[PDB]
Design an enzyme around this catalytic site. Structure first.
Site, short mmCIF file in Angstrom:
data_model
loop_
_atom_site.label_atom_id
_atom_site.label_comp_id
_atom_site.label_asym_id
_atom_site.label_seq_id
_atom_site.Cartn_x
_atom_site.Cartn_y
_atom_site.Cartn_z
N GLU A 790 34.46 -26.91 -39.80
CA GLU A 790 35.65 -26.37 -39.33
C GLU A 790 36.17 -26.67 -40.48
O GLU A 790 36.47 -27.47 -41.17
CB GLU A 790 36.15 -27.48 -37.98
CG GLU A 790 35.21 -28.18 -36.85
CD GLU A 790 34.73 -26.35 -35.71
OE1 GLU A 790 35.87 -26.04 -35.27
OE2 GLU A 790 34.23 -25.78 -35.79
N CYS A 824 45.12 -28.45 -40.87
CA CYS A 824 44.77 -27.52 -41.46
C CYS A 824 45.41 -26.01 -40.26
O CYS A 824 44.97 -25.07 -41.09
CB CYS A 824 43.46 -27.14 -40.80
SG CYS A 824 43.21 -28.35 -39.40
N1 LIG Z 1 39.20 -26.08 -38.61
C1 LIG Z 1 40.05 -28.19 -38.78
O1 LIG Z 1 40.55 -28.52 -37.67
C2 LIG Z 1 40.56 -28.43 -40.02
C3 LIG Z 1 41.37 -30.10 -39.95
C4 LIG Z 1 41.36 -30.43 -41.33
C5 LIG Z 1 41.30 -29.71 -42.57
N2 LIG Z 1 40.58 -28.06 -42.34
C6 LIG Z 1 40.48 -27.84 -44.64
O2 LIG Z 1 39.80 -29.75 -44.71
C7 LIG Z 1 40.56 -28.72 -45.86
C8 LIG Z 1 40.99 -30.03 -46.53
O3 LIG Z 1 40.36 -31.13 -46.43
P1 LIG Z 1 39.56 -31.41 -47.67
O4 LIG Z 1 40.46 -31.08 -49.32
O5 LIG Z 1 39.42 -32.48 -48.06
O6 LIG Z 1 38.55 -30.89 -47.47
P2 LIG Z 1 37.18 -30.20 -48.78
O7 LIG Z 1 36.17 -29.18 -47.89
O8 LIG Z 1 37.59 -30.62 -50.29
O9 LIG Z 1 36.55 -31.91 -48.81
C9 LIG Z 1 35.78 -31.76 -47.61
C10 LIG Z 1 34.79 -32.84 -47.46
O10 LIG Z 1 33.82 -32.58 -47.75
C11 LIG Z 1 33.04 -33.18 -49.10
N3 LIG Z 1 32.93 -32.68 -50.01
C12 LIG Z 1 32.77 -31.72 -50.72
N4 LIG Z 1 32.36 -31.00 -51.42
C13 LIG Z 1 31.03 -31.22 -50.78
C14 LIG Z 1 29.31 -30.42 -51.06
N5 LIG Z 1 29.43 -29.97 -52.11
N6 LIG Z 1 28.35 -31.12 -49.78
C15 LIG Z 1 29.36 -31.37 -48.93
N7 LIG Z 1 30.48 -32.56 -49.01
C16 LIG Z 1 31.26 -31.57 -49.26
C17 LIG Z 1 34.52 -33.86 -49.74
O11 LIG Z 1 33.82 -35.20 -50.59
C18 LIG Z 1 35.45 -34.19 -48.86
O12 LIG Z 1 34.55 -35.34 -47.64
C19 LIG Z 1 41.44 -28.13 -45.68
O13 LIG Z 1 40.56 -25.92 -46.30
C20 LIG Z 1 41.52 -27.56 -44.43
O14 LIG Z 1 41.82 -26.60 -43.41
C21 LIG Z 1 39.97 -27.91 -41.48
#
Ligand SMILES: NC(=O)c1ccc[n+]([C@@H]2O[C@H](COP(=O)([O-])OP(=O)(O)OC[C@H]3O[C@@H](n4cnc5c(N)ncnc54)[C@H](O)[C@@H]3O)[C@@H](O)[C@H]2O)c1
Ligand SMILES: Cc1cc2nc3c(=O)[nH]c(=O)nc-3n(C[C@H](O)[C@H](O)[C@H](O)COP(=O)(O)OP(=O)(O)OC[C@H]3O[C@@H](n4cnc5c(N)ncnc54)[C@H](O)[C@@H]3O)c2cc1C
Ligand SMILES: OCc1ccc2c(c1)CCO2
Ligand SMILES: [Mg+2]
Lengths: 1213, 107, 54
Positions: A790, A824
């Protein structure tokens, strides 16, 4: 460095005993409020008989003299839609200033044919005219029906009907809905009734200022009106002479308890200045009563004004109290005491109250304990009579003003007040153009010889229509509606509410048809509870809990099944002030991450063996623990994640709702045959650090999977607390391991051999990295590892010229800048129809500058920090690129105190085209595009063209535009006439498509089924509709001799839930819809002819088109397709050229599946939900490809109160 | 048009009136794509006629008619099917296409 | 109104001329009455000076 929460929400003044009695009654159960009101409102039998006789006499007079619109409808045989359309046309013709020009346009152009020939729908205000014509409120306008009706009536009746419509609308809008267009005109028109004994209070119609400029305009309108009224009063004084009524919300754009300091500092001096002028002319100045959450704040202003010596010697200050409110008698006690203390004879206008349906909706939305208003109309009537008894005992110190159109209410008070009367003792009040028929039976020596003050709206057509819907609610329970209903006898109208309530079996019971907020979902589950940040008791208790939370030694550790693990430890700093250390996180080594997965795998059988009902009980216990711990959780979220208190409340409520929703969904579905996947890696984002974290973990756990929880590196502490709560609720340590750390920990978990599924919420780019990691992997059964991903949005809102600007601006400010745009769902691109863009943009910029940005441990802070310096740098680099291209950039000025944290000022960037944006900018940055109405469809294409598909908003009153836009937009969560940040679990199941998500939606009924090997049938999940292309394909298969495949195709057609269309239970004043649509174009990678036919059947049965791998060599298997099927079928040699796809179906052995999965992962753009099966699996299992994952869920949330009232609640009394 | 229905009288006059309840909030999506194509090539008059046809079309009307209890009597407007277009000029063809597409038909 | 008042006589003619049973002759006359009243009402709802006859 200021101590955390040391200045969270200090009250304006210490709360006196009388003020505390008000706050204590705010949401008091209705059964507790009524008995003392019944007692206070009791009168003698002689009085009750005399009052009944007076009320009958008044009602007989009213009914004996009882039309303009009705007579027009009759004369021209108009349908209701014709009547509405005619009044809309008349309204538009009256916007032509010159009479000769208007009459020529009517005679030569309108009457003679195409009225359409002569940027704004004629029908923008048709909901209001519908109320006038039909007595019923519709939230949106069927503009095509009105256009047809207008053409029909003009072609049938011509200029004469147009002339009559114009003259009627001119009379109503210039003389009935208002006393005059200007204060001078209103004063001239008041002499006639003043000569008969009426008085006036003028309402300049200011309300709900959105900007400083609005507040200044309303101020100068009030000031100019006071001069005109005072000049006309000419020394008549406050009782015989006219006065003015003001709304505090008109005088400041941030009139709210959260901004109390600005209200006392900035609004109060303005009221004082107006009051000083009213004093000099010796006229009344009345403060109108507004929403329930503004009542107690307004008392702080009343207190200061009445104690201000500069206003001494003047008794004209007035204040409304709303008898529909549970605090009314306690407010009156406070006011009466204030009148005694100050020596000011406060003019107290007792009303029932104007915001009833909005108060019901608000309390439900906020999950509060009870309503601040009564829920049975008769309770308000009793309250009113009880409060009148209190006022009538205090006429020496207050001047009671009984505002009512209800003849029974009037008669009860008239007799309660008794025979001793003098002008100045008390008065009645009524609304202009509504109450005169009744009060002409009251005022004057020949009647009851009691005075009545007429509340007199003054303003232009534009100003009057803004809140006319509220003013007309004319509801089934309203006296004015009932007086005109032939089926309502006088005996019914003169029924004594006091005696009726006293004789009920349970005195004061809540209305049976209105749900308490906790009961919105009935037997399914208990709604989460919020907190009332306008309640001084709540603020005081929350202040202490928040301070206490900042004294806790918050930590996050690698919580393996074997106990806490050692690792690299660092502090967690408050993003709004790096000097505020919130806690410490010990991060997980990649070795321990792999060890945790192995422990989860060893523990998987034991957890799967806990029956689903007991797993769900753990979730429910966790929800109870989170609800109890909410205040402490708020403080942690506020300091760790940069959230305001309001957004932290929503965050904790969402977590509670996830827990209870997945528990209930489990109790509805999961059985022995729905085996868990195995260890699930849950990777969560920082920005919803408890809600999304809890949601993913709870779903996986309750589905029977042990979980490796990897929270975002920015927000480990609240995650650790959530895991602690889940473990306390009974989730064993082996079933739920917390692994704090950065993306390396996430990646090590994803890569671990025993990982059976991944739930990811985060950025699209990271999800793409996880997708690539998993493409190498197969389960022990040789099937792809399920991934729920997501991801981000590029969310648009489209606003047309029918939308109400103030409503739009509020929803835009919230959607774009709440949480500093770090949702998001946040609004990224606002699309304004060209004709209204400048006005809305000016209002939006004005509203932007009223936002308070800072460290979020103060209630007055609207917008907190961005999470890290790197996020700040990324956002600011985008802002500077835009500024460097010449785009207009508006930014709020930041206080110097923000220097200790990482803040980005809310920013508005005016773009030329939607293609100016590349990727999601996760910060407080709103982009604005303008569009011409004819280009609406192209604009929707441009929104879709980003590839995202998360949230989308539309502000319009026009059904044609709603139907068009909602049918063409491709996004998972649609919002009509409201903000776009709604994700109420089980109400707006949340999640998008394209670059925004794989699905299934979190908080929806398909979610748990993805976390088990065999998906259950979700509740309500079926459709009677059969895709017609599927049916054509099934017939083609039979014609080709593929008999078994034709049968399977027919079975898929029936099993598909495509076309499911449900309304989900939720708050009043909203319709929340949930629908299953086709996903789009599915990539088919078959191996055999039969596999292709099964793949095609699955895809077509779910409404999709397909692109079939040309390298399969199966072209000869699809010869002579029906044109309907051929239209859905393409062949693809270069899959990357023929996307984006919306999913994929793969047939092959394990190594073929692995190779195809790698090729699919390499396709540009969206992550594809891939389902694979072997040829033998297709032969053995009719559900080898699950149709749940071949449809797309769409949630649509429609604000049905946006027209100004709630039609459904008009029938609830 | 059907006897005993609201379109019938309009066939017996030289300019058809707008029948009672005869409208639809739905806009044919192919009509919309056609209007955008027309605007792309600068056929401004035709694109406007196309949009106007899209709006005034009653395709998708779906009404319940008053009748006896214990019965639901529905009345719906669908596309006719495939319409034969016999144009003379390019603008005429665009207007014919607009009318047929706005009412859900193929041509 | 005339067809309604004269329905019994009209029934007799329809029964004997067209082979109809009494119930179907009643339906026949009712339908004629309904066409009359329906087209009258549709006219009152729609027709104006610009809707010239053929
Ligand atoms: N569609 C939805 O319901 C929804 C909800 C909330 C946030 N978001 C999205 O989340 C983003 C913001 O959150 P964020 O900054 O924490 O996101 P992110 O992509 O920076 O990080 C998300 C998670 O993935 C982990 N991560 C980072 N690199 C990884 C890798 N190579 N392998 C596995 N895990 C990894 C991070 O540690 C973290 O726990 C925004 O883009 C937002 O739109 C989507
Ligand atoms: C001169 C004047 C000034 C006013 N100023 C204000 C003001 O400053 N602020 C304000 O909020 N209102 C104000 N009002 C009142 C409001 O606008 C309505 O006019 C008033 O509530 C209608 O009550 P009524 O007694 O005339 O009629 P009624 O038909 O007797 O009472 C209707 C009222 O009952 C209440 N009600 C309806 N359904 C329910 C229910 N299911 N449960 C509980 N209560 C219910 C509502 O208050 C509703 O308005 C004013 C009214 C007048 C005449
Ligand atoms: O319609 C009578 C009315 C008068 C004042 C006022 C309201 C209603 C709502 C808030 O302020
Ligand atoms: Mg990141």
């Amino acid at each position: 460095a200021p101590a955390p929460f040391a200045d969270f929400a200090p009250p304006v003044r210490p709360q006196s005993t009388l003020r505390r009695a008000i706050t204590a009654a705010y949401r008091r159960p209705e059964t507790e409020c009524l008995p003392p009101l019944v007692e206070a409102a009791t009168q003698s039998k002689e009085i009750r008989d005399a009052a009944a006789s007076t009320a009958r006499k008044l009602i007989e007079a009213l009914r004996g003299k009882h039309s303009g619109v009705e007579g027009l409808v009759q004369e021209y045989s108009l349908s209701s839609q014709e009547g509405v359309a005619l009044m809309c046309l008349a309204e538009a013709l009256l916007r032509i200033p010159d009479t000769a020009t208007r009459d020529a346009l009517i005679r030569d152009k309108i009457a003679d044919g195409n009225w359409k020939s002569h940027s704004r729908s004629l029908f923008v205000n048709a909901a209001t005219w519908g109320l006038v014509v039909t007595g019923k409120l519709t939230s949106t306008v069927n503009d095509r029906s009105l256009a047809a009706a207008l053409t029909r009536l003009i072609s049938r009746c011509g200029e004469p009907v147009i002339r009559r419509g114009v003259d009627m609308a001119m009379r109503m809008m210039g003389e009935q809905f208002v006393t005059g267009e200007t204060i001078r005109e209103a004063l001239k028109r008041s002499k006639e009734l003043e000569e008969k004994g009426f008085s006036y209070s003028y309402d300049m119609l200011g309300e709900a200022a959105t900007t400083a400029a609005d507040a200044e305009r309303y101020y100068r309108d009030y000031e100019s009106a006071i001069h005109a009224i005072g000049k006309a009063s000419a020394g008549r004084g406050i009782y015989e002479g006219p006065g003015i009524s003001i709304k505090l919300s008109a005088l400041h754009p941030r009139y709210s308890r959260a901004q109390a300091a600005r209200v006392m500092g900035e609004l109060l001096p303005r009221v004082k200045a107006l009051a000083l002028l009213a004093k000099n002319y010796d006229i009344g100045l009345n403060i109108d009563a507004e929403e329930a959450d503004r009542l107690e704040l307004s008392l702080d202003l009343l207190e200061v004004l009445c104690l201000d010596g500069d206003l001494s010697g003047w008794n004209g200050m007035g204040f409304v109290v709303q008898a529909y409110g549970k605090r009314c008698p306690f407010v009156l006690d406070f006011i009466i005491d204030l009148a005694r203390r100050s020596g000011r004879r406060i003019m107290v206008r007792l009303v029932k109250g104007a915001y009833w349906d909005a108060e019901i909706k608000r309390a439900q939305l906020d999950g509060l304990a009870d309503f601040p208003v009564f829920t049975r109309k008769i309770h308000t009537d009793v309250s009113y009579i009880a409060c009148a008894a209190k006022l009538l005992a205090a006429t020496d110190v207050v001047f009671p003003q009984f505002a009512t159109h209800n003849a029974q209410t009037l008669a009860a008070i008239y007799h309660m007040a008794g025979k001793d009367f003098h002008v100045g003792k008390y008065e009645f009040q009524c609304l202009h153009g509504m109450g005169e028929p009744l009060y002409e039976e009251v005022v004057g020596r020949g009647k009851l010889d009691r005075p009545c003050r007429i509340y007199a709206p003054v303003g232009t057509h534009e100003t009057l229509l803004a809140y006319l819907v509220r003013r007309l609610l004319g509801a089934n329970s309203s006296f004015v509606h009932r007086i005109n209903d032939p089926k309502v006898s006088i005996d019914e109208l003169i029924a004594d509410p006091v005696e009726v309530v006293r004789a009920m079996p349970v005195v004061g019971a809540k209305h049976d048809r209105i749900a308490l907020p906790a009961e919105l979902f009935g037997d399914a589950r208990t709604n989460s509870a919020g907190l009332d940040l306008s309640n001084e008791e709540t603020l005081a208790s929350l202040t202490e809990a928040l301070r206490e939370s900042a004294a806790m030694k918050w930590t996050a550790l690698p919580q393996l099944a074997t106990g806490p693990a050692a690792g690299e430890t660092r502090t967690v700093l408050n993003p709004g002030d790096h000097r505020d250390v919130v806690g410490s996180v010990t991060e997980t080594s990649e070795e321990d991450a792999r060890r945790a997965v192995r422990l989860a795998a060893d523990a998987a059988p034991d957890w799967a063996a806990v029956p689903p009902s007991e797993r769900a009980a753990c979730l429910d216990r966790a929800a109870e623990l989170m609800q109890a711990r909410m205040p402490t959780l708020l403080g942690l979220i506020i300091r760790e994640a940069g959230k305001s208190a309001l957004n932290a409340i929503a965050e904790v409520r969402e977590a509670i709702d996830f827990l209870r929703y997945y528990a209930e969904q489990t109790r509805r579905t999961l059985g022995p045959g729905h085996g868990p996947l195995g260890p699930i890696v849950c990777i969560s984002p920082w920005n919803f650090p408890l809600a999304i974290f809890t949601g993913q973990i709870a779903a996986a756990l309750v589905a029977g999977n042990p979980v490796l929880a990897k929270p975002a590196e920015e927000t480990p502490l609240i995650a650790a607390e959530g895991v602690r709560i889940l473990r306390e609720a009974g989730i064993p340590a082996s079933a739920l391991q917390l692994l704090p750390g950065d993306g390396r920990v996430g990646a090590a978990l994803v890569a671990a051999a025993e990982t059976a599924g991944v739930m990811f919420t985060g950025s699209t780019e990271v999800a793409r990295l996880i997708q690539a990691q998993l493409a190498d992997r197969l389960s022990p059964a040789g099937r792809p590892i399920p991934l729920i991903a997501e991801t981000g949005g590029q969310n648009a809102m489209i606003v047309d010229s029918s939308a109400l600007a103030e409503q739009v601006v509020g929803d835009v400010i919230t959607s774009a800048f709440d949480s500093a745009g770090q949702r998001c769902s946040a609004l990224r691109v606002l699309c304004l129809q060209e004709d209204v863009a400048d006005r809305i943009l000016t209002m939006l910029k004005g509203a932007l500058h009223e936002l308070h940005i800072g460290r979020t441990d103060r209630l007055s802070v609207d917008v907190g920090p961005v999470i890290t310096s790197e996020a700040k740098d990324n956002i600011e680099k985008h802002i500077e690129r835009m500024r460097g291209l010449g785009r207009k950039v508006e930014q709020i000025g930041l206080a110097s105190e923000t220097g200790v944290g990482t803040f980005v000022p809310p920013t508005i960037i005016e773009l030329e085209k939607l293609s100016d944006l590349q990727r999601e900018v996760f910060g407080p940055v709103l982009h604005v595009i303008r569009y011409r109405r004819d280009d609406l469809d192209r604009l929707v294409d441009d929104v879709n063209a980003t590839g995202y598909g998360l949230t989308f908003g539309l502000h319009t009153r026009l059904d044609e535009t709603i139907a068009h836009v909602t049918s063409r937009i491709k996004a998972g969560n649609l919002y009509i006439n409201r903000n776009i940040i709604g994700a109420v679990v089980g109400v707006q199941p949340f999640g998008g498509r394209g670059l925004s998500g794989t699905g299934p939606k979190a908080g929806g009924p398909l979610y748990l089924g993805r976390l088990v090997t065999t998906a259950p049938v979700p509740p309500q999940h079926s459709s009677v509709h059969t895709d017609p292309v599927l049916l054509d394909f099934a017939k083609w298969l039979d014609g080709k001799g593929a008999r078994a495949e034709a049968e399977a195709a027919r079975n898929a057609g029936s099993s598909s839930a495509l076309g499911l269309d449900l309304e989900l239970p939720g708050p009043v004043g909203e319709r929340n819809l949930y629908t299953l649509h086709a996903r789009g174009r599915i990539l088919l990678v078959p191996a055999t002819e039969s596999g292709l036919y099964h793949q095609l059947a699955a895809a077509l049965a779910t409404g999709n088109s397909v692109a079939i791998d040309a390298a399969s060599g199966l072209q000869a298997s699809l010869k002579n397709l029906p044109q309907t099927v051929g239209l859905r079928v393409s062949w693809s040699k270069d899959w990357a050229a023929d996307g984006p796809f919306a999913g994929a179906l793969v047939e092959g052995d394990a190594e073929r599946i692995r190779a195809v999965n790698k090729a699919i992962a390499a396709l540009p753009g969206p992550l594809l939900l891939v389902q694979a099966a072997s040829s033998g699996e297709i032969a053995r299992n009719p559900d080898a490809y699950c149709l749940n994952w071949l449809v797309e869920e769409v949630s649509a949330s429609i604000n049905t109160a946006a027209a100004g009232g709630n039609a459904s609640l008009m029938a609830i009394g």
